[PDB]
Paper text:
Member 6 of the vanilloid family of transient receptor potential channels, [name], is a master regulator of organismal Ca2+ homeostasis. [name] acts as the major dietary calcium uptake channel in the human gut3, and as such, this channel remains constitutively active, while its activity is regulated positively by membrane lipids such as phosphatidylinositol 4,5-bisphosphate (PIP2)4–6 and negatively by Mg2+ ions. It consists of four subunits and features a transmembrane domain (TMD) that houses the central ion channel pore, along with an intracellular skirt primarily composed of ankyrin repeat domains interconnected by three-stranded β-sheets, N-terminal helices, and C-terminal hooks. The TMD includes six transmembrane helices (S1–S6) and a re-entrant pore loop (P-loop) between S5 and S6.
To avoid possible interference of Mg2+ inhibition with CaM-mediated inactivation, we utilized the C-terminally truncated hTRPV6 construct (hTRPV6-CtD) that lacks the CaM-binding site and has been extensively used in the previous structural studies of [name] as its function is identical to wild-type channels with the only exception of lacking CaM-induced inactivation. Single-particle cryo-EM analysis of purified, lipid nanodisc-reconstituted hTRPV6-CtD, henceforth referred to as [name], in the presence of Mg2+ yielded a 2.97-Å resolution hTRPV6Mg structure. Besides the densities for a magnesium ion tightly bound inside the channel selectivity filter and annular lipids surrounding the TMD, commonly observed in the previously published [name] structures, we observed four spherical densities, one per hTRPV6Mg subunit, around the intracellular entrance to the ion channel pore. Each Mg2+ ion in these putative Mg2+ binding sites is coordinated by the backbone carbonyl of K484 in S5 and carboxyl groups of D489 in S5 and D580 in S6. The pore in the hTRPV6Mg structure has two narrow constrictions, one at the selectivity filter, formed by the calcium-coordinating side chains of D542, and the second at the gate region, formed by the hydrophobic side chains of L574 and M578. This pore conformation is typical for the closed-state [name] structures and different from the open, apo-state structures. Typical for the open-to-closed transition during [name] gating, the narrowing of the hTRPV6Mg pore is accompanied by a ~100-degree rotation of the S6 intracellular portion. During this rotation, S6, which has a π-bulge following the gating hinge alanine A566 in hTRPV6Open, becomes entirely α-helical in hTRPV6Mg. By recruiting D489 and D580 into coordination, Mg2+ ions, therefore, disfavor the interaction between D489 and T581 and stabilize the closed state, accordingly. Mg2+ binding to the D489-D580 site prevents separation of these residues and rotation of the lower part of S6 that accompanies channel opening, thus locking the channel in the closed state.
Residue numbers in the entry:
A (entry chain B), B (entry chain C): 27 to 55, 73 to 407, 423 to 638
The structure:
Amino acid sequence: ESWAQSRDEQNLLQQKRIWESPLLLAAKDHQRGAMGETALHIAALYDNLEAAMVLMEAAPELVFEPMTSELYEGQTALHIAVVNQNMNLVRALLARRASVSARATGTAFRRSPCNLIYFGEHPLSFAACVNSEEIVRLLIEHGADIRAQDSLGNTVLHILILQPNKTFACQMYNLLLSYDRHGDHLQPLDLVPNHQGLTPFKLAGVEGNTVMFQHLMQKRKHTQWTYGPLTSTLYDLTEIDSSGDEQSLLELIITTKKREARQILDQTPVKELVSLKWKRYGRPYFCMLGAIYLLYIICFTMCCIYRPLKPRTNNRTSPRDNTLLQQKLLQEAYMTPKDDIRLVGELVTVIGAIIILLVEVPDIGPFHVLIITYAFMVLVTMVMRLISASGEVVPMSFALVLGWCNVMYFARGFQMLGPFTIMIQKMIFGDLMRFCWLMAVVILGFASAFYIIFQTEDPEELGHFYDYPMALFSTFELFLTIIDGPANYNVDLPFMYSITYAAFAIIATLLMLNLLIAMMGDTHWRVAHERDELWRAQIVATTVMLERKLPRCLWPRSGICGREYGLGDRWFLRVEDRQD
Amino acid sequence: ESWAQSRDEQNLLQQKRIWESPLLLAAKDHQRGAMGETALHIAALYDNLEAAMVLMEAAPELVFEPMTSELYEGQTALHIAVVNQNMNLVRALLARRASVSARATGTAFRRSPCNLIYFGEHPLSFAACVNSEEIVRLLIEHGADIRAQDSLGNTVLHILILQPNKTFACQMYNLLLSYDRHGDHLQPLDLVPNHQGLTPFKLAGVEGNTVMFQHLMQKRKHTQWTYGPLTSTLYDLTEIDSSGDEQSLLELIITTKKREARQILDQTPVKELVSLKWKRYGRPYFCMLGAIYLLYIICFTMCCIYRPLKPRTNNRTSPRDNTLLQQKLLQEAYMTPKDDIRLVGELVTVIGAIIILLVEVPDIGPFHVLIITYAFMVLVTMVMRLISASGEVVPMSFALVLGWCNVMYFARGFQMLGPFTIMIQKMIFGDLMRFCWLMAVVILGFASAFYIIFQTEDPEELGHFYDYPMALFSTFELFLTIIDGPANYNVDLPFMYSITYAAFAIIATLLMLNLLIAMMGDTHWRVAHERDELWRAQIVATTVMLERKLPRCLWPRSGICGREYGLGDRWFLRVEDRQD
Ligand SMILES: CC(C)CCC[C@@H](C)[C@H]1CC[C@@H]2[C@H]3CC=C4C[C@H](OC(=O)CCC(=O)O)CC[C@]4(C)[C@@H]3CC[C@@]21C
Ligand SMILES: CC(C)CCC[C@@H](C)[C@H]1CC[C@@H]2[C@H]3CC=C4C[C@H](OC(=O)CCC(=O)O)CC[C@]4(C)[C@@H]3CC[C@@]21C
Ligand SMILES: CC(C)CCC[C@@H](C)[C@H]1CC[C@@H]2[C@H]3CC=C4C[C@H](OC(=O)CCC(=O)O)CC[C@]4(C)[C@@H]3CC[C@@]21C
Ligand SMILES: CC(C)CCC[C@@H](C)[C@H]1CC[C@@H]2[C@H]3CC=C4C[C@H](OC(=O)CCC(=O)O)CC[C@]4(C)[C@@H]3CC[C@@]21C
Ligand SMILES: CC(C)CCC[C@@H](C)[C@H]1CC[C@@H]2[C@H]3CC=C4C[C@H](OC(=O)CCC(=O)O)CC[C@]4(C)[C@@H]3CC[C@@]21C
Ligand SMILES: CC(C)CCC[C@@H](C)[C@H]1CC[C@@H]2[C@H]3CC=C4C[C@H](OC(=O)CCC(=O)O)CC[C@]4(C)[C@@H]3CC[C@@]21C
Ligand SMILES: [Mg+2]
Ligand SMILES: [Mg+2]
Ligand SMILES: [Mg+2]
């Protein structure tokens, strides 16, 4: 906001600085403006060729001079004439020995959501982005280095992938790569990583640049044979399944926050790779990891069904006291064979909860949080068991609910069941997290109204609202229509009740059907229309988690290795498809 | 998986075997490779004409030699040059006396979902499938037999129907059939069955090859007269209603597992045939078979309403014992006129259940299973009645529910009601069989939580959860909101209950609306959009069942017989339509 305010004022400052100097005004159609610009910059800016030539005759040092602002730092007139595509000025600027290697470190050039363009820092990178082949053919003739890297580390190959017109990005990727012609450099330009470690092939995957993914994939395709309609294609599979030493391209797509990246999961070498590694080793481990967790939660349940309880030593403290049984002490808890059989299962439970923490906590989405909370609630149950602290029903009840709802995590192994878990998340963190603020406020209004209406009345007849916390809970239950409307029929209720509850009943049906239409638009189109895409993104997330947390003996590398077939040491995936 | 692994390794083995031999490498641009191939095979594979000619000059025995692998067994170079459509090589191979009758018995050629192509075994069958008319015009000139049959028994007529480009399949069907020119053979080529017994006309129906159904139907159309816009067309109806000796084409479409086959039910001779036989004899028997079954289930109900019961001889065994009446013994069950009137209806019931087993069990979808289970539960009721075994309420209650829900089978006679039964099946074996795994797991988590919260409390106030099987059943009922939320208001419930039940109530509404949107997508588009198609497939299934299980006197053959009209002994169906 404040920065956007300053840019505009600096841009309005610049228009004043042009008007003050008649020479700078003449350039518009040694003094410097608000942006640090010169007359050569302004003539290049508005494509004033004749003003630029007359100024460069007087000052030929003006060509070398960069803008001095923070917004346009390092920018020379050559940058301006390049993006404005004035060919004859670019020729004239190079004739006056313009630097083709100048770096524009200005904030307006840096990759940021505030800036609409990201063109890099070098005139090659500016020229390729504005799609001028000739200037690229002209700048390299004057010593411009294609291997130039930015503050982000991007070369021009990386920058073209980050451009909104993906078709022009393809041709300029072709042109600059054809101009390398070096074998002496340890990395060719397609193989040069940026500072994040992403190659141009990896960058197209992370950004969801689909056509740049496809063009780069043709370099990694070898066609073995063609049998009429059939053809056999062998895929390099080096970067899309790099594992054991570095993050995979599949791993980068999952961790990135771009929904466009997940379309790359539907591209051909990626798709059969994921489906193969899922069917080969992905499913039978995950269903085995599912069955072990299910027997664990059943073992945790039985220890909670048979928890140590004794008749209460105390007398009843009120007529409203319903307690009959209390927790045993520690020595009382274990003195019999049934207590020893439970002690085995409770020890299995705690050892299971410790193993959960070991495979989860030293590592650091939602099912991460649910199982860590479940393992945490188990340890609190043991701690209270050891010190004989009362209230163990509170950690267990969290753990029974959290422990069983983790069993729903293993629905994603089945193809139909997995997007149903997607529905549950989007309904609760979308439509529920929105509408609960409208919904609780109606509950607070009517529960307060319902409380004071029965505040004079006797609670024995109608105790829905006997104190204010129960009046909140009852009105919540009346909202969802899970308990009946309060009625006695043997006594006179207040007349203000019948008006309020009829007003409540209309709003509660109206608001609850509104939550249904909101959850209608969610699960129908966002999830059930895209069930195959969402389930595939679940597999890649599940498998990458499996690969990190499993030994090498269990997980063989996917594809077929060369050097027994003379292809390299790389792991190749063969796909046979029908071209018809 | 493992077989797909082996094929790729064998394909990568083959690329090594080419590189080792310089002669085999020269063929790529007497030794044999991994696939058993030769240099002539590899030259034919990559369309290397000049390498093939030089090799066949040296070895002319190489033309005769087949590949020796399991994957490509029996394949010669003539097969390879045919599918690759190298005309000049095919001419050159025939000039060296190539076998046109060689059979490729390899696993890659066999019809299987692992193999993308099914081309048959003979070079005629390969040439027609890759759509080369000239090679077919050339191979027959060298002695190729069109009547060749595979291990599946398919001739080239059958194979063309099994091809994904149905338009090219039509022309090659025309070309090969025009080349038969034999009357001496007992079956012409359109009439030659495969090993399954299917002709090319029957095969197009079973596979749902609609345009091959239409082209073959024109041969079975005779146009009687044309009256301006009106025309009268007479259909052969021989194979689409073969009955009394063999399965019909209608019967093949029902029993097959292809959804594409049911579009053939909407083709013109099929459609009016089904609608005619349904209206003529299909409905009035089925509604008669419906009314007889309805009076049977009403008779079974009245025998269960009036089942023999006496006051209990024992005393009450607990304060929680609600039993007042018990079953009579066998001699007590029948000693009065009302007992004799029930004995008639019970004998009608058992004789009815035996007749169900006779018309169902010696024969061996869902309503098959439901009525056999109903007839089985009836016989258990009699067995327990005879030996005075207690617990007869268990077989009856299964039989009352199963017996009445069979009456829903007769909804398909009515056109609107039939797809509603489709909805019930798809919702229960789709959306229910999926979502019950997510839904029971939430129930198990909260019922366990609800149990231990009230494990200390006294059950007399709140006995929803007094033991663990009732806590499961109550939480199931709270999930569907068919019983009210537990509340006392005269006693203090645990505070962990109000948190857990509010957590339960949100999830239970959220998950239950999710089941509604899932059942929304089911019944709307899968069934109600396709209600006429689903109801028509119900008729064909019902009628074919009727034809098997009814005497000849009740079911006359459809159409109009010739030989009283001089058309043959075949049964013809006349359809008058408006061509406008
Ligand atoms: C007494 C001992 C031998 C019992 C064995 C304990 C297991 C029942 C637990 C221990 C650690 C495991 C778990 C821990 C880590 C994973 C991650 C997993 O899901 C996520 O959190 C993924 C993130 C997301 O998708 O939201 C939860 C279960 C899983 C496979 C495991 C399931 C069950 C395991 C084998
Ligand atoms: C004893 C009571 C008070 C415990 C409180 C209940 C809630 C805190 C928990 C338990 C049941 C729910 C969970 C149950 C299952 C879902 C699935 C959901 O789905 C996904 O992760 C799909 C995306 C993916 O990871 O692939 C994530 C958490 C969620 C809403 C829940 C998180 C929180 C909930 C509301
Ligand atoms: C969407 C809406 C507009 C539906 C239209 C129906 C309501 C406008 C009517 C239905 C019958 C109700 C009435 C029925 C009876 C009650 C009792 C009330 O006075 C009493 O008798 C209270 C009893 C007592 O004092 O003991 C006055 C009107 C009231 C709330 C109601 C006013 C309005 C209600 C909701
Ligand atoms: C004492 C006697 C004379 C009473 C007569 C007994 C009938 C009530 C039963 C005997 C066998 C019959 C049935 C047995 C065979 C059929 C199959 C039918 O449905 C299927 O199973 C088709 C498969 C499917 O679509 O799922 C169910 C009832 C029906 C017509 C019959 C309905 C009723 C019938 C006439
Ligand atoms: C006493 C209690 C414990 C009996 C248990 C009830 C269920 C086992 C049964 C009885 C009612 C249901 C049936 C009722 C009717 C339907 C129609 C459905 O319809 C079709 O077959 C349409 C397809 C076709 O055949 O054309 C098949 C079975 C189904 C879901 C049900 C099969 C199973 C259900 C759940
Ligand atoms: C979709 C959701 C987020 C809608 C928003 C409403 C809930 C957040 C509020 C509504 C009023 C409820 C509260 C109302 C009163 C209860 C009683 C409880 O303590 C008691 O008084 C128990 C009684 C006893 O100990 O005898 C503490 C909070 C609780 C569960 C509630 C906490 C949260 C609830 C569900
Ligand atoms: Mg949402
Ligand atoms: Mg009620
Ligand atoms: Mg379904």
